[PDB]
């Protein structure tokens, strides 16, 4: 009924009160060794499950090193959600971050 809907609209109002908007983001512009070791992790676990690839892979069977080839050329469709400890967050992309 709507006791799901009254249970749903509270969450999407809660989930909208925690996204810090893009003109007001206040964390680092860097990829702080923990995004980088996990973005390369999860993307390598997508190419092993037939994700669409967007680079001239050059006989590189190793599924981890394929993601590095797309990391240094910025073809990754990921978005990092960084939880500030009250529950608020800043959905950084992978383009707008700056690698080490």
């Amino acid at each position: 009924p709507e006791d799901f809907q009254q249970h749903e609209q509270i969450r999407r109002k809660t989930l909208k009160e925690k996204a810090i908007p893009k003109d007001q983001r206040a964390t680092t512009p860097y990829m702080t060794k923990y995004e980088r070791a996990r973005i390369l992790g999860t993307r390598a676990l997508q190419i092993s499950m037939n994700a669409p690839v967007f680079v001239d892979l050059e006989g590189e069977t190793d599924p981890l090193r394929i993601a590095m080839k797309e990391l240094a050329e910025k073809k990754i469709p990921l978005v990092i959600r960084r939880y500030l400890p009250d529950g608020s967050f800043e959905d950084w992309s992978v383009e707008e971050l700056i690698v080490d």
């Binding site: 999860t42 676990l45 997508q46 959905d91």
Partner: protein, 199 residues
């Protein structure tokens, strides 16, 4: 102490919307659209094509089947819209990858045209066969109801020639026939419908 715990037993088996006896043909109307919200996966092979990737995995194995959460038989859908996980609408919606797997889960609203029979409905289907055991029907070319003997008016007999029916008209009767609906079944993979021919 037998009031406060009955608030969740009757209220759940109080099935929400009934079937109106509309259209002035005597027949009751059971085709009905309900909007819902799912919670589905999305495989990484469909991670460029998220439209097909939800229709093919969770909706297409659900059409023309019963569903225990809506109460009807799913006939179709239109309006599969992935809720974006970014509370910014836009075309580049984003979903959340699970930690332990590369599979992402997301919410989707859709409008399922369920077909909803209950008891006390008025239904008509083409007579499939008939014996001195039942009369098998084809409700809307696909659904089968079967009024058994102990719910038939016991005036009406059966002549054998594999044979044909004996009513008070004395007719081998054609397809189109009205009856009233007993317990709709849920048991097998085939959805059995069951009814009575008392008036």
């Amino acid at each position: 102490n037998e009031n406060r715990e009955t608030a969740r037993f009757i209220k759940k088996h109080k099935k929400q919307v009934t079937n109106p006896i509309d259209e002035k043909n005597g027949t009751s109307n059971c085709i009905v659209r309900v909007p819902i919200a799912l919670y589905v996966s999305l495989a990484p092979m469909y991670l460029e094509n998220p439209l097909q990737g939800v229709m093919k995995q969770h909706l297409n194995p659900l059409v023309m089947k019963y569903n225990n959460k809506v109460g009807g038989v799913v006939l179709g859908y239109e309006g599969l819209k992935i809720l974006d996980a970014d509370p910014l609408d836009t075309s580049e919606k984003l979903i959340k990858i699970t930690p332990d797997t590369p599979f992402g889960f997301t919410w989707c609203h859709v409008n399922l045209y369920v077909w909803q029979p209950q008891v006390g409905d008025v239904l008509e289907g083409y007579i499939f066969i008939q014996s001195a055991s039942h009369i098998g029907l084809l409700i809307h070319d696909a659904f089968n109801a079967s009024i058994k003997k102990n719910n038939i008016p016991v005036d009406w007999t059966f002549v054998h020639n594999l044979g044909h029916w004996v009513d008070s008209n004395g007719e081998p009767i054609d397809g189109k026939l009205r009856f009233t609906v007993r317990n709709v079944h849920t048991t097998g993979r085939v959805v059995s419908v069951d009814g009575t021919l008392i008036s």
